[PDB]
Ligand binder design. Sequence first.
Ligand SMILES: O=P(O)(O)OC[C@H]1O[C@@](CO)(OP(=O)(O)O)[C@@H](O)[C@@H]1O
Ligand SMILES: O=P(O)(O)OC[C@H]1O[C@@](CO)(OP(=O)(O)O)[C@@H](O)[C@@H]1O
Ligand SMILES: O=P(O)(O)OC[C@H]1O[C@@](CO)(OP(=O)(O)O)[C@@H](O)[C@@H]1O
Ligand SMILES: O=P(O)(O)OC[C@H]1O[C@@](CO)(OP(=O)(O)O)[C@@H](O)[C@@H]1O
Ligand SMILES: O=C([O-])C(=O)[O-]
Ligand SMILES: O=C([O-])C(=O)[O-]
Ligand SMILES: O=C([O-])C(=O)[O-]
Ligand SMILES: O=C([O-])C(=O)[O-]
Ligand SMILES: [K+]
Ligand SMILES: [K+]
Ligand SMILES: [K+]
Ligand SMILES: [K+]
Ligand SMILES: [Mg+2]
Ligand SMILES: [Mg+2]
Ligand SMILES: [Mg+2]
Ligand SMILES: [Mg+2]
Lengths: 466, 466, 499, 499
Amino acid sequence: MSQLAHNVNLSIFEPISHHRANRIVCTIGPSTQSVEALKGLIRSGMSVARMNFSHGSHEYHQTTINNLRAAATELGAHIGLALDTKGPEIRTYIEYPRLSITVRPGGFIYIDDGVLSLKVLSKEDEYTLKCYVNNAHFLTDRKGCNLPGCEVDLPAVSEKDREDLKFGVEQGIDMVFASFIRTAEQVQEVREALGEKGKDILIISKIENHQGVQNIDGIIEASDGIMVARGDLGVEIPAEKVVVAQMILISKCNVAGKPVICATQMLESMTTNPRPTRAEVSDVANAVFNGADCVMLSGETAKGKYPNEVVQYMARICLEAQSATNQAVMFNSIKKMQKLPMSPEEAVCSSAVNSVYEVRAKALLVLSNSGRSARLASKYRPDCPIICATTRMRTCRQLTITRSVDAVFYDAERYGEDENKEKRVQLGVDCAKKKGYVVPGDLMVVVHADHKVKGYPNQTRIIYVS
Amino acid sequence: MSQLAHNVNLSIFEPISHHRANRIVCTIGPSTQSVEALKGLIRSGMSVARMNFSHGSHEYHQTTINNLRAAATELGAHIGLALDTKGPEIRTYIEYPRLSITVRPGGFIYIDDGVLSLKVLSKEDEYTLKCYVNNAHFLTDRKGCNLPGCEVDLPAVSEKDREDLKFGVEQGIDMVFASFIRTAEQVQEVREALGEKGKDILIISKIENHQGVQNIDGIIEASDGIMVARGDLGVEIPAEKVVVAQMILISKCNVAGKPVICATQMLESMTTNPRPTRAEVSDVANAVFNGADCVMLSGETAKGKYPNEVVQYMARICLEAQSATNQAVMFNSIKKMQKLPMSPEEAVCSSAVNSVYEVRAKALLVLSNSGRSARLASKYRPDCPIICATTRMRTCRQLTITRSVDAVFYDAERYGEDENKEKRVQLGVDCAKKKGYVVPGDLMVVVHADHKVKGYPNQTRIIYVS
Amino acid sequence: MSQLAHNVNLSIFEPISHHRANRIVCTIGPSTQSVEALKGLIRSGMSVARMNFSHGSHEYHQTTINNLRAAATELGAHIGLALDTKGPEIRTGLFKDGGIALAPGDTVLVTSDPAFEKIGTKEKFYIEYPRLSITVRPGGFIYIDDGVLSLKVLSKEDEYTLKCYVNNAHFLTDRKGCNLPGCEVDLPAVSEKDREDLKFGVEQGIDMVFASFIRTAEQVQEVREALGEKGKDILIISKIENHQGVQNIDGIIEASDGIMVARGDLGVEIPAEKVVVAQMILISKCNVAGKPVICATQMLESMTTNPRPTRAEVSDVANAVFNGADCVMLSGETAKGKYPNEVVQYMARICLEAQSATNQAVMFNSIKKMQKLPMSPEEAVCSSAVNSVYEVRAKALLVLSNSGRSARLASKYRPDCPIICATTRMRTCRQLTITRSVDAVFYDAERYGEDENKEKRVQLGVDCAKKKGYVVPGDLMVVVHADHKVKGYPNQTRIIYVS
Amino acid sequence: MSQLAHNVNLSIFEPISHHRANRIVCTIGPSTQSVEALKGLIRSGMSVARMNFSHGSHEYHQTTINNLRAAATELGAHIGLALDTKGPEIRTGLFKDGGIALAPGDTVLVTSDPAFEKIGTKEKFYIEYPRLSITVRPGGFIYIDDGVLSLKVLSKEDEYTLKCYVNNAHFLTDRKGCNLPGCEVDLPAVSEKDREDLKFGVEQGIDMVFASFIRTAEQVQEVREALGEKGKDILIISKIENHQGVQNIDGIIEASDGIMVARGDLGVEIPAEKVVVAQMILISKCNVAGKPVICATQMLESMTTNPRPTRAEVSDVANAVFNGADCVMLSGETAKGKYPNEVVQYMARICLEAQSATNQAVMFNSIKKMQKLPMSPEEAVCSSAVNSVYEVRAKALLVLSNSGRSARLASKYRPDCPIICATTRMRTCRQLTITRSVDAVFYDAERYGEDENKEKRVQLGVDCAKKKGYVVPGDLMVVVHADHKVKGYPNQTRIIYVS
Ligand SMILES: O=P(O)(O)OC[C@H]1O[C@@](CO)(OP(=O)(O)O)[C@@H](O)[C@@H]1O
Ligand SMILES: O=P(O)(O)OC[C@H]1O[C@@](CO)(OP(=O)(O)O)[C@@H](O)[C@@H]1O
Ligand SMILES: O=P(O)(O)OC[C@H]1O[C@@](CO)(OP(=O)(O)O)[C@@H](O)[C@@H]1O
Ligand SMILES: O=P(O)(O)OC[C@H]1O[C@@](CO)(OP(=O)(O)O)[C@@H](O)[C@@H]1O
Ligand SMILES: O=C([O-])C(=O)[O-]
Ligand SMILES: O=C([O-])C(=O)[O-]
Ligand SMILES: O=C([O-])C(=O)[O-]
Ligand SMILES: O=C([O-])C(=O)[O-]
Ligand SMILES: [K+]
Ligand SMILES: [K+]
Ligand SMILES: [K+]
Ligand SMILES: [K+]
Ligand SMILES: [Mg+2]
Ligand SMILES: [Mg+2]
Ligand SMILES: [Mg+2]
Ligand SMILES: [Mg+2]
């Protein structure tokens, strides 16, 4: 079916799957830092907690880290913990050494979330310029600002940035959202600051400016994932262009099989209102239609007054979108963008998803220790939940950004090695049952290795749940 | 190309066509009723002015009617004039006779744009019920409210409604937006109230509730077009379901070849802010990707403080979306949903668009007196402007809701009959030149009749602009 | 790609694939019965040997069976042995001199009087159809010899005999086949002679039957009864040589193990041009159904006497492969021809050419799209293995199959590489000779053990692929069998590197 | 739909379309030269008559031209008259008795000594190739008679003669064609004899040339020179009968008006199985290019002597249509056969069957998708007319064409209805006989006027469609010509109801 024919035949009043495939990121703040509120977030459907290191002492974030782990352990929940960097930020005389030998007479310097426009006339000396206020406004201390024109000469990883990432490694974060990534080598610089000790931590590059967009191929190649950081992006490039940026980045990550997060103002009005606007409901649903793994929440939960409800909405919208998607068409078009010949693992994951569609399997079970194979299954967009039986707790938590996945922990030190995969496969099936995805009689597709092969999955299996 | 492959290859930094295909509806109010402001709307890119008869005296709207015609004639602009009915509205004790024998103990009565929830417990007598306030609030006089559960026993066309439509016929409106259309026969009732004198006026049914959605096939069959009225819709059915409603209605109208308008809160935050939110930019762009002819503005221009700017944004977003669309894929999937055999006119319009793509024509020119053939060309979604040379001024104004069309008036009483079509064809070409769409050398596709045939187009032509 | 775009990009002077997927069925006869001639056909490309029980005694066919088995053993070949039944078939008797010549305008007497079986002349000769004079009325047609001889019926002479008018020149040979198309032929689906042939076939351990003139599912049912419990594992391939066969194709495929498009008779029973369409229907339907199909009769006709085929013959063969036939067949050409070996070599050369001219991934997908969801686990697994073959450009696909059920279900999805089938039944090796792409190797379980592991059969298969020159250490294979728990069907797919 | 899904839904006992789109080319010979026999072929289905200038004198062909013109006039038929050149062709001389018989093992002497032209024997005979002994060295092969006779060269005897070893039984007839595939043949692209033939053809007003052995665009260029200014409107159809022809197909199509897949020789010059692929390349490329293509040689071979074809012959013909050929051809079968009329009737019956088995909308779209954008206005218009045909299930498509350029460009897009071409040139009527779907009617402008309106030619076309039984009042047609202003090409499409 074409998109057109598909749309014409959508049911609207028949009920839907309740197994929500997409993942919701939440930013923690005053509204949501208490343990009790973190529990509400988890219950309401958060999978990842975002610490925004553009604000607050190491000590402030320590509280977040503590309260979360308290909430998550209490509820038995796996929750990605993410550290979002300050980056080469610019706040306010304004904080930017090379400001004058960097910005042209004629260009633009927007301030305070893009609201205040200013045009440059000439250079006064080595410090500042004299400019032209294009619309009136009032202007707090310490407000963020963009230089759409010039490419900024601040470092990808500042000194504060080293101290933050170091603190992050020490607290065992699961992933990094690196603000303002412009190139592949900047990604490499984040990788370095993390060092040997932080080498198993996911870097999600935030694309926030012109150059990030231009270098997307390279950044994707070097990162574990992308965030479409639309706040800054919408100020750095014309507002309407962001729509195209979002489509490009989401689809390229989809082809690359790397998680991608859509961010910023998705349900903005819910910062203060019980109900979202019509535009906002549609934004969330369309980020899912674009192929986004994750949709994110910022102000809405950091400092909003409806943090449970806003997440509940987000979850409800994702479910609806998910059910209005022709998922087999997604699977297929992704398959078609892959080079032949595939590696054996990739052909296996691709083919397992094929089987899922062929037998209408109710669950897909994959053994992954690093998450590689989980992400490789999810890359192919099956219409069912992916159970991942994993030996690492870090993997459970990192897999919270990947569409469709519920991770289950096999404690190998306690229960044995499981060379023949039987204990892990059993653990996965029980998980699928416990969660209501399957019952005896249903078909499952299972992915792992045969007896000989080590270091990747090379086998698919179709089994009947007992 | 798949959607996926398409998205991966979008340019973002190359420039685009500036011939905007989609149309922008504006609601007139305190911010926009003066002649000078109406001129700004026209300049900023309004094509249709919406009078909201849910508020204001006949005398208030008379001002609007006058100021508009003053602005439009001054600027030489063609502007659809639309009358949006009060309908079976409910404001506030609440205004609804059969309220108690109509609503169940257990159902819901939301009030004031969906904000205030109330659950029904039992029946007191023949007047009112006693209910349960689910969230606190403050509650002005005269606030609109919905009954999601029951199907309302108010008339499709009330008495006020007759007086309004009668006033509308007398003022020569171009089209009607009928609130709360639930069935085909309700459409028929609007048609009756309009009478013989109003028989050439377009009825655009507003879909705003459960039943409208269920009966869409029938309503489309009976109407000239649809509006996705998402304000009321988002309160009558679960918020997230509107996303699906929008997709169904837009595509069905697209298959039916009838104009469709997407409405309500598209750039809401711009009621007060100079910049739209990220969610709002995306809403507008996605309504264009859905296949909407028109996107609409309500509060944003009725009572907003940035009415020019908000329209300018809307126009800029439409252009971007339009340019990121695979328009040939749209053309094709529409063609494929039509029954064989087509009528000759339809095969002609379909085929002209085919030629447009084949020779990359820069303009498509069609002679239509009623608009039939204009709408029939636009149905097939060419990637160029459609010039329509028409003999009726009412047609120019009604064609303002149809994608891609610029209408040009041939004054037949003044200039002659033009049986061989030469004067009208010349008029159309000059129009395309005047507007910068073509220059000598370019190819145009032209649609009208051969010398013999009367009452529809049966001929296509490919010509070189001199 | 579309068919058009595909064609304009075909190469003609580039190398082609070396591994022939289609299979060749050879009819045995004077030219071909000796052990030596059999070795000849095997080396030349024969996968299947067809005994035509329309000629010869049981003893005659015993010679064929013995010689075939001796030649196959010398060469270490699996060769399917097929018994093609007489059916409800009307043949002529014998002619004085072993031949008679007929001229347009002439009359002749056609009789069912058995007295005249041996002594056919210009003036009277015998056809074996006792109810001739009741069945074919004046103004009817009797066709003879692949329908090349046209006779019109003038009158009934007596209880035995019709007077006929000769329409065209022909030289008539002993015991030709006749067609009465405008007619209800009063004849058993399975005659007494047929039951004996079949029973004989069962004792002699044939692999498959080619059942002539199959009209209905019920008749397939009859042949199945006739093989009995003892013969239950023998494949039945139904021959579609008439109107009703084509009409009832869906049911005949249901009941059957396979289909032969028997074009000789079919081209006389129905207008000649409609054979083209029936050929396309039967092949594609067998493909969709996953049952082997064979295209037969006159494919390389002129090589009965000539060391090279006509241009028409060559494209007939290629198009049969393009249509999607598993097998193409020979008749005249191997039974009594002058070039039994070269005609086979030509057929195999034409198959390979067409094979490599095919867009095989598109075949595969076509077939997939025509199957109901949900699939059985077996079918998803096989379908998906083949999917994996294309994704990794695998050099061979190995499937463990005892019945052959799983091998046929793999081959169903039309991979573009050899399929190895490790089988624990010798008979299955031989029955898989009519299935595109399959090479079978035998695993002697009695002599080597249960192999619940599957390792021994997997190794055997890999080694078979190596011996055949399909793979070397480093190459990817796709392997299909069951996990440790599941019995009765495959539920597992592995992609391995060849050690 | 996919090819598979299409097939499984083909019907075989449902009615078929009645309006034959493909065209039949008949070679004239003894069997067919009389006026009466010509009327015979015309009524039977011949659209084109091929003179083979490899046999017969100018006077002989004059008889053919005259008889054809007399028969076409009696019947009011447009028949394309084609001159098929000798080319750089090597034929044998004459044999005593008009035939000789050769046995495997034998030697024979093959000589280029003209003394031996008339007197060929078992022991020595003549082939017309003066440079024989230089060109074909020991251990080479000489093939004769559609490459059925195989001789190996042993030694050179003298300046004229080679000793050869006979590979197989054959009965050799006077003046057969020879192939030296392993060889540079020292022969003119256009001999002196050729220039005269062509010049003769030009005076006699032939419609088209079938140019033998065309190797390069330059050689097409040579034939064009040879026709001169006077012959500039004659169509050149290049025959691809060798390696270089296939190799240089893209350039030969550029230079040519069309292509014949001449399979007789081609099947000897290149491995027999590769003809299948060359056939698919040439046809599809001509389709993409919008130039007519003909498939030739041995299509219905056995009907030279038999009143019905073989199963192979029938599918050869159908598959040529499926491939997308405009025309299929006859040779032996009409020139010297016993059933000139029935062989044509069979061919037309097979064409129609295959035509109706085709998914014609899919042909059309394939071809569209293979064209560069932007198209010329002409091409968009024609492409879009055909588009309209499918959309309204039109009963006929009318196009005004004087050169035939626009008719060929309409037919290019493979509508599934008759195309009427109103033309002001009698020659165009006759040249359009090799273009699928076209029926031409003649508009006598000198006698009826300028018709800048187009009304007179539009009416003429509609009336032609009525006479032919394609349309009645009420039916939809699609009509293609120019608006009032544009000259030199069509830029306009109309859908009308037939009054
Ligand atoms: O952790 P990743 O890289 O996803 O790989 C996991 C895969 O490797 C294997 C084989 O080595 O792991 P395991 O050894 O835990 O059984 C597969 O069974 C499993 O699917
Ligand atoms: O006004 P609608 O119904 O679109 O029909 C207009 C069509 O009818 C015709 C023919 O009657 O109008 P007109 O008579 O003005 O020339 C066509 O030329 C024209 O395209
Ligand atoms: O014999 P068929 O029906 O083809 O099925 C064979 C399949 O069954 C299984 C399991 O029963 O056989 P086996 O037990 O011989 O190993 C699979 O391994 C094998 O692929
Ligand atoms: O002769 P060709 O090149 O086919 O083109 C003929 C076309 O040119 C035109 C216009 O020149 O011919 P005509 O002037 O004879 O009417 C079209 O009407 C006609 O369809
Ligand atoms: O960093 C962000 O999330 C942004 O600016 O959108
Ligand atoms: O009527 C409307 O426009 C609405 O409620 O959305
Ligand atoms: O028996 C056959 O094979 C036939 O009739 O073609
Ligand atoms: O000349 C021919 O037609 C041939 O060689 O096939
Ligand atoms: K940050
Ligand atoms: K209203
Ligand atoms: K038989
Ligand atoms: K010739
Ligand atoms: Mg940012
Ligand atoms: Mg409303
Ligand atoms: Mg038979
Ligand atoms: Mg030749």
